[PDB]
Design a protein around this nucleic acid. Sequence first.
RNA 1: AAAUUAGAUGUAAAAAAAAAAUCUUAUGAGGGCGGAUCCGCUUCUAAUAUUUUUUUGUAGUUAUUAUUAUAAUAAUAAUCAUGUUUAUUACUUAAAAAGCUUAAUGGCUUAAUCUUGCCUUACUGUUUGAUUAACAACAAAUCUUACAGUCGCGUAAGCGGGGCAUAGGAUCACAAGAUACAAAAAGGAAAGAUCUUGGAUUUUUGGAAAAGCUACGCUAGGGAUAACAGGCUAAUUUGCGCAAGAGUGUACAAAAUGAGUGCGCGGUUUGGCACCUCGGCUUGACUAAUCCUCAUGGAUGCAGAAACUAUGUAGGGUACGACUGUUCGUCGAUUAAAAAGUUACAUGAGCUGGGUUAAAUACGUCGUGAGACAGUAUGGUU
RNA 2: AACAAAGCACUUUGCAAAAAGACGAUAAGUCUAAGUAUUGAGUGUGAUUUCUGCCCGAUGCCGGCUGGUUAACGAAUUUUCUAAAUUGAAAAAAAAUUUGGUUUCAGAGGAACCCCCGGUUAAUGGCGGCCGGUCCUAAGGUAGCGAAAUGCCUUGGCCGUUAAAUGCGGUCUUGCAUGAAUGAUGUAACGAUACAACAGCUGUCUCUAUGAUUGACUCAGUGAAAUUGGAAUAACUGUGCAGAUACAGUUUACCUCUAGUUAGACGAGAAGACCCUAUGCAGCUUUACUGUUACUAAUUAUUGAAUACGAUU
RNA 3: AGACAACACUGACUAGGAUAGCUGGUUUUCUGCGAAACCUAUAAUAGUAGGCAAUUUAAGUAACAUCUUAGUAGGUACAGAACUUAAUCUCAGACAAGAUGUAGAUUUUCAUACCUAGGUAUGAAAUGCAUUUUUUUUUGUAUACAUCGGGGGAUAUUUUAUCGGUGAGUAUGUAGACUCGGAAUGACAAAGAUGAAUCUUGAAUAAUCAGACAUAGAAUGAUAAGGUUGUAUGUCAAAAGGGAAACAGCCCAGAACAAGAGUUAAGGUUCCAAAAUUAUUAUUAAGUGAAAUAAAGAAAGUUUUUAUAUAAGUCGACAAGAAGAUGGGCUUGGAAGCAGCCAUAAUUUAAAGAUCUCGUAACAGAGCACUUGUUAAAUCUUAAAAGCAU
Lengths: 168, 96
Amino acid sequence: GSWLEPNLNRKKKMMKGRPRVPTGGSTKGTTVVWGDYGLRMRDHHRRISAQQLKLAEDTIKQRLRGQKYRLYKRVACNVGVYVSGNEMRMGKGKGSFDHWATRVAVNQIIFEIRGQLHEQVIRDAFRLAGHKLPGLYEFVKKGDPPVVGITKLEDGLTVEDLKNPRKK
Amino acid sequence: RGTLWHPGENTIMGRDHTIHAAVAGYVKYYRDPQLHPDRQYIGVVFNRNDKLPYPKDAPRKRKLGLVAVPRKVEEVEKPTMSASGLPLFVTRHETI
RNA sequence: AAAUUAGAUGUAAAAAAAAAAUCUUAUGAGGGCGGAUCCGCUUCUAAUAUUUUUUUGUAGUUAUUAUUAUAAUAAUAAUCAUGUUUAUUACUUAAAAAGCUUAAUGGCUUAAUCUUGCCUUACUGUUUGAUUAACAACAAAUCUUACAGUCGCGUAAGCGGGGCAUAGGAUCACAAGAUACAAAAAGGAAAGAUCUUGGAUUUUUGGAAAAGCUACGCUAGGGAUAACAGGCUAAUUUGCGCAAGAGUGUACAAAAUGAGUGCGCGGUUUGGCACCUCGGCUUGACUAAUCCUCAUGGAUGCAGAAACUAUGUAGGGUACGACUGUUCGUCGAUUAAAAAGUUACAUGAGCUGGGUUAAAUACGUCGUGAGACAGUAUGGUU
RNA sequence: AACAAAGCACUUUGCAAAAAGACGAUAAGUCUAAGUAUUGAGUGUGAUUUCUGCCCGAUGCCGGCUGGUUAACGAAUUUUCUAAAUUGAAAAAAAAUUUGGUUUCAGAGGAACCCCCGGUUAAUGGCGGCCGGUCCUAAGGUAGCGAAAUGCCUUGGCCGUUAAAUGCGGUCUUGCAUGAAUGAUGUAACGAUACAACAGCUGUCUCUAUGAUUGACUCAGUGAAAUUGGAAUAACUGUGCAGAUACAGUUUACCUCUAGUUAGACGAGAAGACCCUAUGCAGCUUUACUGUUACUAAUUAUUGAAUACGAUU
RNA sequence: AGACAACACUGACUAGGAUAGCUGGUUUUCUGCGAAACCUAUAAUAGUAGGCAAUUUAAGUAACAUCUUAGUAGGUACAGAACUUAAUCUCAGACAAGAUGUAGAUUUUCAUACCUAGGUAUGAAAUGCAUUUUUUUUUGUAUACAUCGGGGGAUAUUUUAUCGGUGAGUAUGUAGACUCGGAAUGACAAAGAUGAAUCUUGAAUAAUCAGACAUAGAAUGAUAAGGUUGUAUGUCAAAAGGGAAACAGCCCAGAACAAGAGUUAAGGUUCCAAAAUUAUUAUUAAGUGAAAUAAAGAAAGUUUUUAUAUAAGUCGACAAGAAGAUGGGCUUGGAAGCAGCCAUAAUUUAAAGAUCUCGUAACAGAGCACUUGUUAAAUCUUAAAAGCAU
Ligand SMILES: [K+]
Ligand SMILES: [K+]
Ligand SMILES: [K+]
Ligand SMILES: [K+]
Ligand SMILES: [K+]
Ligand SMILES: [Mg+2]
Ligand SMILES: [Mg+2]
Ligand SMILES: [Mg+2]
Ligand SMILES: [Mg+2]
Ligand SMILES: [Mg+2]
Ligand SMILES: [Mg+2]
Ligand SMILES: [Mg+2]
Ligand SMILES: [Mg+2]
Ligand SMILES: [Mg+2]
Ligand SMILES: [Mg+2]
Ligand SMILES: [Mg+2]
Ligand SMILES: [Mg+2]
Ligand SMILES: [Mg+2]
Ligand SMILES: [Mg+2]
Ligand SMILES: [Mg+2]
Ligand SMILES: [Mg+2]
Ligand SMILES: [Mg+2]
Ligand SMILES: [Mg+2]
Ligand SMILES: [Mg+2]
Ligand SMILES: [Mg+2]
Ligand SMILES: [Mg+2]
Ligand SMILES: [Mg+2]
Ligand SMILES: [Mg+2]
Ligand SMILES: [Mg+2]
Ligand SMILES: [Mg+2]
Ligand SMILES: [Mg+2]
Ligand SMILES: [Mg+2]
Ligand SMILES: [Mg+2]
Ligand SMILES: [Mg+2]
Ligand SMILES: [Mg+2]
Ligand SMILES: [Mg+2]
Ligand SMILES: [Mg+2]
Ligand SMILES: [Mg+2]
Ligand SMILES: [Mg+2]
Ligand SMILES: [Mg+2]
Ligand SMILES: [Mg+2]
Ligand SMILES: [Mg+2]
Ligand SMILES: [Mg+2]
Ligand SMILES: [Mg+2]
Ligand SMILES: [Mg+2]
Ligand SMILES: [Mg+2]
Ligand SMILES: [Mg+2]
Ligand SMILES: [Mg+2]
């Protein structure tokens, strides 16, 4: 399939669910792994649609057209969102398929980029993509430390320090 | 549904895989790698302090489970005539 | 592409001996001390396991090489084999899948699968303990024990009261067998009783033989469930703002214009929930997201004029007519302009009753019909 | 605009004891009628002009076989219990047969309805698709009419009428969903029916003004009513069974009446109106369930004979 | 016309004979205890029955509750990528030896035809670079022998930093029907201890069967509802009192009656209004705020921190400079740094992009990057982050 159209059945209805909320110190998906720069969702955990991620991709291509770059996607739309009619009454079963979506935890990377381009030219492409995506986004470089929840592990900070009851 | 636990010491499995107690004791959940390295068993021991599985070289621990009563010696006195003066049984034999 | 057959892990198979320690066990020494066998302390011995532990030995046989005088010594290699090599035997060979009466889940590979032999226990009566006192009661249910009776398989121990497990409703009436209970004066019988058994979309499946209209309607109730309004909400809206800027603007992003979007306000439209069971006329009040009038910034795209956009600003004004029951909308002709919204979509104990609108009636459509209709038409105690 | 109506049409009625129809806990009997097929009753349509097409398959009704079916009746069959007798058994014994009583089974033949054949549309009713061709039906909407009292789309198109036409009139039509006695269509005459236009006329309006009488107001006389938990009964914002004179906060207000006015007191009155509920009702409908009748058919009895023919075989 | 038949007519009036699982009502005091709005069944869903269970007071208790210690069942949060699901990323290939042709130095060893055990040669090898090597016409070792179709282009034919597929990865993510790892909590039972009899049984015998809100976590809806529906806990219901301005459900706390500057909870202490105008250190200048947080975002508001510049003159202003090959080549009517395309090693300078912003039809021309000088700061430059504000 694709990162926007999975090889799943639209008839099997999926429960709403919730995005992951790491409460045990997990940094899963909070670092740049493939590209040199990344786009991080820094505010809150959300469920992004496939039409919003497609527009974000078009915005990065429209701004970087005519140049050499490699765009990576770290999210996959594998969550079916079934919307019942707004004009319908409550009950009478679950709604029909509307669109695909993906659940993203806080401080996770959405897009990564690698190419022979200038940093400022990539900051603008991610700035525009962030403007059109739901929530607040941030520019990240490869090598930056991971994030535990909403706290960055900077200046020798470790996960065991965040778990230690004594922190004063 | 199926044998998640297997019948061990002093237990019997039912038709529907239900595990029962076969003696009066205390339930025990344990594993026996000597008998099977991938099974877990349920047992019943007579002493709450016993630990299963028992070592294969130790004597079986078993209880009598009987009560002593005086034996009944039968008396050969069954009468032949009933209280009404009638025979309790009449015997007939054929002839060829 | 799809027919059959043959394959698809590895190891082991002469043989050990010895010392200590760590537990754990013992219906071992009838151990000892207290309160033979029970309980608490316990020393010794024995057994399993564990240590990478202190080690000793690792031959014999067949052959090879070297040395020594065919034999001895050392080293190297091979070595399950007294057995019709198609060897055999033991252990090992992820997960999924196949199979196991039917879906799914769990389970079985050391059997619950498969093959074969002999069989019918898919037995009769009674009965134990459970399902943390089955289904959060009762009942119909599920699992299980023992005794008696007598059959099967097995060398034996023993197993067997259907199926690997989880998806088939009673009473009543009726019918077929048994039991020897009672027998309405008496002898019989009939009709009854007990046990076994059978026939059910009794499917509203704890089990009635059962179609509609009412706008001519009635009674008891509910607002415990609707239509109007209010309340909550804000998907949506013919309501707006801000951010970013693909693009249009001969040039030039932001004079004007603004794709698909993101962040919000507001409570006008259509909706959700269920706290709670029209229009016109007259007369206002209020809001400001402004149609005119007043001040004003920007405008390769502000010469002037007029208009565009935007900022202040709600004092006053925003009229007349034709059509439509109309708010709305369309149109005629003037005007500086002929803008909106809230107020129970202001105002019927102020008016109107054209729309909606009970009884009458007709048309079309639907209905076997009585009748019905988000239909249409004339009339209808304000 | 509904009903009736003159007219039109269909069905029915032969009168010999009761013409049919209606009435009669149910009859005698009455009306029909001192009538007789040009009579009476029932049904639909609704003067007259011009007309009333296709389908008898379904439903209803009528007619029809020396037919089928066929309840009662009935040829031929059969059983339970018991009494007595016989046979049998004659051992602890039933069992079988005949008869009496008692109690069951049983159906060759044998009515109407029904099955079957035909007739009937001013009987209830029906009157097509696909692309000149083709499939289907009992038959496929004929004549005429047609944005209609019938039309959702829709304010259909065009013309006339208006300064401006969702109206009205004329006209074309592919008419969601016209149609021929549930009649089709066009005039004269008639209408407190409905719609539209013109002229005149007007206080309907622009836009009201003045005048008159009676009430309203005051004095004297007489003297009600609905209503009322109790009240010392302000404004705003908020709150709250979610719209406050009464709660919170703040503001404002000397006490008490009269005449006006109706914004609120979710004002009053009417269980008035709607929706829903009840194993509550009523009337009506029908191929709902279960029943009773009209009516039809057969037959014991009242009720006795003759002859022939036909069919069973 | 369901019209009329004497208040009434889709069937009058009157006398006799009803029911109503529905609505309303049910009258003195004191005292003790004290629910439920759930399950199952029902022609049920406004009802009813049986349970759970409120009450009365006897008979029992190895009762019941709680904690401690040891033990047991079970897989949630979390975490992870093993198995399974979605998507994505990387790799798909290396060494040793041998062989091959080559350029060498012409020493040594070896095989050869010689001469006379040496030597002239003549060949090979040794030494140094390549080449061949994942199934080859190259064996071995180590490894998963480790890869196929289609479509472009190149020349029946080969090739790919293109698509799909296979293999490998202790690569990245994803989770109601994934759980290898794995809590707390809760549940079961044993002993002991504690406690307010709270437990069981016997006998007697009810009410209740739309619950509401808060908190956490879900399904549903639209990650809306004072929405609907489960789970856990509590309150209200049936609970007054203090706090939350007013307040069923929130924070405290359970009212038998009085007295007290009594002791406290939540909550507060300038005045309304009982109690601090009580102390310490900072921030804010907006009445922001002060008992119901409006967002993204903007910005010489301010503070702090962390980097950083400065008499080698920071920062700002001012003065002058800012060359030459050269009008780079192409394109174009024209393209001269500045429409577009390609290139953009140099050169000389205190420095100067084959050119960043205006300008010309094209040149010209005015600025910038950059360079020097003058003025001039002795805690005084610039930037970022954070806090509170606009
Ligand atoms: K016909
Ligand atoms: K016929
Ligand atoms: K016929
Ligand atoms: K017969
Ligand atoms: K026609
Ligand atoms: Mg965004
Ligand atoms: Mg089997
Ligand atoms: Mg067998
Ligand atoms: Mg139970
Ligand atoms: Mg008798
Ligand atoms: Mg039932
Ligand atoms: Mg049941
Ligand atoms: Mg009507
Ligand atoms: Mg309600
Ligand atoms: Mg200007
Ligand atoms: Mg003024
Ligand atoms: Mg209104
Ligand atoms: Mg009013
Ligand atoms: Mg009238
Ligand atoms: Mg006529
Ligand atoms: Mg007659
Ligand atoms: Mg008529
Ligand atoms: Mg007519
Ligand atoms: Mg008979
Ligand atoms: Mg016959
Ligand atoms: Mg005709
Ligand atoms: Mg007709
Ligand atoms: Mg007076
Ligand atoms: Mg209020
Ligand atoms: Mg008061
Ligand atoms: Mg009033
Ligand atoms: Mg008045
Ligand atoms: Mg009527
Ligand atoms: Mg009447
Ligand atoms: Mg109490
Ligand atoms: Mg409760
Ligand atoms: Mg029932
Ligand atoms: Mg009820
Ligand atoms: Mg696990
Ligand atoms: Mg609620
Ligand atoms: Mg209550
Ligand atoms: Mg209280
Ligand atoms: Mg206060
Ligand atoms: Mg004090
Ligand atoms: Mg004070
Ligand atoms: Mg303030
Ligand atoms: Mg050039
Ligand atoms: Mg130029």
